[PDB]
């Protein structure tokens, strides 16, 4: 696979930014910080028993962030491969 | 062998303006002068800007 | 939660004051001396005033934040 060097450079920069930002988001989501609450796919029933459930959904979103950061890692490697290929 | 000679003259005319620019400050000086080129050794806005 | 309006003001006031007052005495001689000392002083002034205004905005708060019952329920566990 091949593409123009400028597009490949855009790819690498985009991938790096994605990795960093989503690492930050996953870190804070796994910390369960309140700041990100509204992004949690919480359900009304959960606010009865205790906060452990919302912790686990926080972690679900955190894992999901880490996964997307992984896809960005693969994309970054891919785009770097193309950049050096050109 | 005949020499060159340089003469001063007490001048009522307005001189040009200069600000001893450097790489870092060049953009800022350009920006502050864009609305108008400063006058003779008047306060330069660049350093504080 | 020990967020006094005593220690933060001293720490940050002395921080920016050092930057804006003592640093100019340590900057070496040079052509860029003027812009450098100006940078130090103006940075100290501006940043210190910015942070000061921001914190005094919270000193003696007049009205409280309004929060969804969801977040109130969650924070009751989460925060001090």
Curated annotation (Swiss-Prot), chain B:
It is found in: Cytoplasmic vesicle, Clathrin-coated vesicle membrane; Cytoplasmic vesicle, Secretory vesicle, Synaptic vesicle membrane; Melanosome. It comes from the Eukaryota. The modification Phosphotyrosine is found at residue 18. The modification Phosphothreonine is found at residue 14. Belongs to the V-ATPase 116 kDa subunit family. V-ATPase is a heteromultimeric enzyme made up of two complexes: the ATP-hydrolytic V1 complex and the proton translocation V0 complex. The V1 complex consists of three catalytic AB heterodimers that form a heterohexamer, three peripheral stalks each consisting of EG heterodimers, one central rotor including subunits D and F, and the regulatory subunits C and H. The proton translocation complex V0 consists of the proton transport subunit a, a ring of proteolipid subunits c9c'', rotary subunit d, subunits e and f, and the accessory subunits ATP6AP1/Ac45 and ATP6AP2/PRR. Interacts with SPAAR. Subunit of the V0 complex of vacuolar(H+)-ATPase (V-ATPase), a multisubunit enzyme composed of a peripheral complex (V1) that hydrolyzes ATP and a membrane integral complex (V0) that translocates protons. V-ATPase is responsible for the acidification of various organelles, such as lysosomes, endosomes, the trans-Golgi network, and secretory granules, including synaptic vesicles. In certain cell types, can be exported to the plasma membrane, where it is involved in the acidification of the extracellular environment. Required for assembly and activity of the vacuolar ATPase. This is V-type proton ATPase 116 kDa subunit a 1. It comes from Rattus norvegicus. The gene is Atp6v0a1.
From Swiss-Prot, chain C:
It comes from the Eukaryota. It holds the Pfam family ATP_synt_H. Expressed in brain (at protein level). One of its GO terms (biological process) is synaptic vesicle lumen acidification. The chain crosses the membrane at residues 7-27, 35-55. One of its GO terms (molecular function) is proton-transporting ATPase activity, rotational mechanism. The gene is Atp6v0e2. Keywords: Cytoplasmic vesicle, Glycoprotein, Hydrogen ion transport, Ion transport, Membrane, Synapse, Transmembrane, Transmembrane helix, Transport. Its main location: membrane. InterPro entries: ATPase_V0-cplx_e1/e2_su, ATPase_V0-cplx_e1/e2_su_met. It comes from Rattus norvegicus (Rat). One of its GO terms (cellular component) is synaptic vesicle membrane. It is found in: Membrane; Cytoplasmic vesicle, Clathrin-coated vesicle membrane; Cytoplasmic vesicle, Secretory vesicle, Synaptic vesicle membrane. This is V-type proton ATPase subunit e 2. Subunit of the V0 complex of vacuolar(H+)-ATPase (V-ATPase), a multisubunit enzyme composed of a peripheral complex (V1) that hydrolyzes ATP and a membrane integral complex (V0) that translocates protons. V-ATPase is responsible for acidifying and maintaining the pH of intracellular compartments and in some cell types, is targeted to the plasma membrane, where it is responsible for acidifying the extracellular environment. Residues 28-34 are cytoplasmic. Belongs to the V-ATPase e1/e2 subunit family. V-ATPase is a heteromultimeric enzyme made up of two complexes: the ATP-hydrolytic V1 complex and the proton translocation V0 complex. The V1 complex consists of three catalytic AB heterodimers that form a heterohexamer, three peripheral stalks each consisting of EG heterodimers, one central rotor including subunits D and F, and the regulatory subunits C and H. The proton translocation complex V0 consists of the proton transport subunit a, a ring of proteolipid subunits c9c'', rotary subunit d, subunits e and f, and the accessory subunits ATP6AP1/Ac45 and ATP6AP2/PRR. It is a multi-pass membrane protein. Residues 1-6, 56-80 are lumenal. The keyword Membrane applies. Glycans are attached at residue 69.
């Amino acid at each position: 696979l091949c593409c123009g060097p400028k597009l490949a450079a855009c790819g690498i920069v985009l991938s790096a930014w994605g990795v960093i930002m989503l690492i930050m988001l996953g870190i804070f989501f796994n910390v369960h910080s309140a700041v990100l609450i509204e992004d949690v796919p919480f359900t009304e029933k959960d606010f009865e028993n205790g906060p452990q459930n919302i912790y686990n959904l926080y972690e679900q979103v955190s894992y999901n962030c880490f996964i997307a950061a992984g896809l960005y890692l693969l994309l970054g490697g891919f785009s770097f491969c193309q950049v050096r290929l050109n | 062998t005949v020499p060159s000679i340089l003469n001063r003259m007490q001048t009522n005319q307005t001189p040009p303006t200069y600000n001893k620019t450097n790489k870092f400050t060049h953009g800022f000086q350009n920006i502050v002068d864009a609305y108008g080129i400063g006058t003779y050794r008047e306060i330069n806005p660049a350093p504080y800007t | 939660t020990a967020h006094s309006f005593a220690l933060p003001v001293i720490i940050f006031t002395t921080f920016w004051g050092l930057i804006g007052i003592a640093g100019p005495w340590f900057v070496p001689k040079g052509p860029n001396r003027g812009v450098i000392i100006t940078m130090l002083v103006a940075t100290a002034v501006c940043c210190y005033l910015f942070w000061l205004i921001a914190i005094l905005a919270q000193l003696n708060p007049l009205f409280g934040p309004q929060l969804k019952n969801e977040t109130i329920w969650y924070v009751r566990f989460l925060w001090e």
